[PDB]
Amino acid sequence: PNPYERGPDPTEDSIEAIRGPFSVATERVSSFASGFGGGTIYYPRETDEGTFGAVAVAPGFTASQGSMSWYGERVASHGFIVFTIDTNTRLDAPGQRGRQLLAALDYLVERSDRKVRERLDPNRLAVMGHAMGGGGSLEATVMRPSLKASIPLTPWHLDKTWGQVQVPTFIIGAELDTIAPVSTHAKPFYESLPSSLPKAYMELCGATHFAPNIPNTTIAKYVISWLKRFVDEDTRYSQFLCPNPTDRAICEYRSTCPY
Ligand SMILES: O=C(O)c1ccc(C(=O)OCCO)cc1
Ligand SMILES: [N+]
């Protein structure tokens, strides 16, 4: 029995559903928090199944947490703590956004409310980011290799080599992305990840740079599965990740299955 498994046995319908089995409560964190510009914590109300893991979600260049708000109720209702954060300034670079993703996770572990702290397993943390926040997601794993998962969403970064990343990384790219072209960003990041790293690359057909900013079932179903598999060690979700998904919305998928 996995001590981290939460919720009933999943199906493809359950991971695609807009609402998971857990009721969600929210809390506002002031932007004057140390190390980052505040945000909103989405946590499950139910507590009788055990403490949950947490993921901090970073926005892109000049964007706020509102561009990532739909991940809050979507992911947290499946049994996770979600921290959609704002950066110190809207002009922050990927390297700075990686530091503030860690500062957001440290706030959850060290200085969070007792409603949040009681529901948090501080040993199982993850990061997720959009574009420049996706570059900061890669940065956060190099800065903290003890992280359990990492999901760069249409990532943007000047550094193309990530052969020292030790955290399971799930890169999602948009085929028609011209701001962070997958040929020069998303794919070079994935191919430079260690060949032995538990990694995956999902390219969405005909998607643009800001597709992760609105509800997307294809993004939602496999972001949930990736967090479940590596933050919860929940092998009940390995069926959705290995072998490679065959969704019509996916134009290309690469992975190092089995995990
Ligand atoms: O012009 C760029 O280099 C550049 C432009 C935009 C971004 C970015 O993070 O897009 C997401 C904003 O919501 C990254 C780099
Ligand atoms: N595919």
Side-chain angles (χ1 to χ4, degrees):
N2 190 343
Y4 310 139
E5 277 181 13
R6 312 284 181 263
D9 290 335
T11 66
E12 193 173 16
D13 195 66
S14 65
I15 66 174
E16 285 187 341
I18 293 185
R19 258 169 248 281
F22 292 93
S23 55
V24 176
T26 68
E27 176 175 13
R28 296 191 187 274
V29 170
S30 159
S31 60
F32 298 113
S34 189
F36 71 116
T40 302
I41 304 176
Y42 300 79
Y43 62 90
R45 286 168 43 182
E46 294 81 345
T47 59
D48 51 18
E49 296 192 16
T51 60
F52 306 90
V55 54
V57 193
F61 183 60
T62 69
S64 66
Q65 59 175 310
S67 56
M68 314 295 292
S69 61
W70 75 277
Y71 294 99
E73 303 272 342
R74 191 76 173 252
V75 173
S77 64
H78 285 76
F80 293 103
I81 299 171
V82 174
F83 201 175
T84 57
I85 69 168
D86 291 319
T87 50
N88 288 322
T89 72
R90 42 196 296 273
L91 306 175
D92 285 353
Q96 300 167 299
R97 296 171 184 269
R99 286 295 172 189
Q100 307 171 24
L101 277 163
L102 299 180
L105 295 175
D106 295 334
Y107 171 90
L108 292 169
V109 176
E110 300 172 324
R111 306 170 222 97
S112 74
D113 189 302
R114 94 145 175 86
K115 311 191 305 291
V116 173
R117 201 94 71 96
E118 280 180 331
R119 295 169 165 90
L120 176 59
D121 192 339
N123 304 286
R124 306 187 287 111
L125 309 175
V127 288
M128 182 165 55
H130 173 238
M132 274 202 186
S137 184
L138 294 163
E139 291 267 359
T141 58
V142 180
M143 297 167 178
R144 185 164 303 186
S146 56
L147 293 171
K148 297 297 183 175
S150 175
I151 307 179
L153 301 161
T154 60
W156 187 98
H157 207 316
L158 304 166
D159 301 330
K160 314 299 179 183
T161 306
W162 301 94
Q164 301 306 313
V165 172
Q166 305 176 83
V167 180
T169 301
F170 183 23
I171 301 182
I172 297 175
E175 174 192 4
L176 303 179
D177 197 327
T178 58
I179 301 181
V182 299
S183 68
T184 61
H185 288 264
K187 294 189 179 191
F189 302 155
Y190 173 84
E191 295 297 328
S192 75
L193 291 176
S195 62
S196 50
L197 184 71
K199 56 179 190 177
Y201 169 70
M202 179 179 66
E203 182 167 327
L204 305 170
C205 287
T208 69
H209 184 61
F210 306 94
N213 299 133
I214 55 177
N216 188 289
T217 297
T218 305
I219 297 182
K221 63 185 301 181
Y222 297 132
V223 160
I224 292 169
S225 300
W226 194 266
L227 294 177
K228 282 285 195 178
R229 171 59 183 84
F230 293 107
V231 179
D232 298 8
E233 303 178 10
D234 195 348
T235 51
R236 302 174 299 174
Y237 289 78
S238 303
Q239 49 173 137
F240 312 113
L241 298 172
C242 301
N244 298 347
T246 65
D247 297 53
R248 191 205 286 98
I250 301 178
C251 262
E252 193 172 55
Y253 201 102
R254 306 165 176 176
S255 71
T256 53
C257 288
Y259 299 142

